[PDB]
Amino acid sequence: LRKIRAAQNISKTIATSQNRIYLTADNLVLNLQDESFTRGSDSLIKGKK
Amino acid sequence: LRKIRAAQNISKTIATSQNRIYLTADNLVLNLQDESFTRGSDSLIKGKK
């Protein structure tokens, strides 16, 4: 069983490492957006007294 | 039956792995630009009356 032990150790050493890949999430938001309008102006002639 | 289920499990364990590339980035850097320079290396001689 010393034989088995050695085999175990070697097999495990070879075993390393494992592989896995990522599906990550990104958080944190500090993007405040401002206001905008739809421009509106008319072609007019105005006059004051 | 058992053979099928066991085969399923073995195949499942060995096969699975994920390769999903999913990354986003967010780096915000703030710099200050106050009123800019208004100068030039002009050499002139001046004096008050």
Curated annotation (Swiss-Prot), chains A, B:
Tell me where in or outside the cell this protein is found. Mitochondrion inner membrane; Cytoplasm; Nucleus; Cell membrane
Give all N6-acetyllysine modified positions.
K12
Q: What induces it?
A: Expression increases approximately 3-fold upon entry into G1 phase compared to other phases of the cell cycle. Also induced following inhibition of mitochondrial protein synthesis by thiamphenicol.
Q: In which tissues is it expressed?
A: Expressed in myoblasts.
- Modification(s) after translation: Phosphorylated. Tyrosine phosphorylation is indirectly stimulated by IGFBP6.
Would you indicate the residue range of the signal peptide?
none
Q: What this chain does, per the record?
A: Protein with pleiotropic attributes mediated in a cell-compartment- and tissue-specific manner, which include the plasma membrane-associated cell signaling functions, mitochondrial chaperone, and transcriptional co-regulator of transcription factors and sex steroid hormones in the nucleus.
The record comments on the domains as follows:
LC3-interaction region (LIR) is required for interaction with MAP1LC3B/LC3-II and for Parkin-mediated mitophagy.
How does this chain assemble? The mitochondrial prohibitin complex consists of two subunits (PHB1 and PHB2), assembled into a membrane-associated ring-shaped supercomplex of approximately 1 mDa. Interacts with ESR1, HDAC1 and HDAC5. Interacts with ZNF703. Interacts with STOML2. Interacts with ARFGEF3. Interacts with SPHK2. Interacts with COX4I1; the interaction associates PHB2 with COX. Interacts with MAP1LC3B (membrane-bound form LC3-II); the interaction is direct and upon mitochondrial depolarization and proteasome-dependent outer membrane rupture. Interacts with IGFBP6 (via C-terminal domain). Interacts with CLPB.
- Protein's UniProt name: Prohibitin-2
Organism lineage: Eukaryota, Metazoa, Chordata, Craniata, Vertebrata
Protein encoded by which gene? PHB2
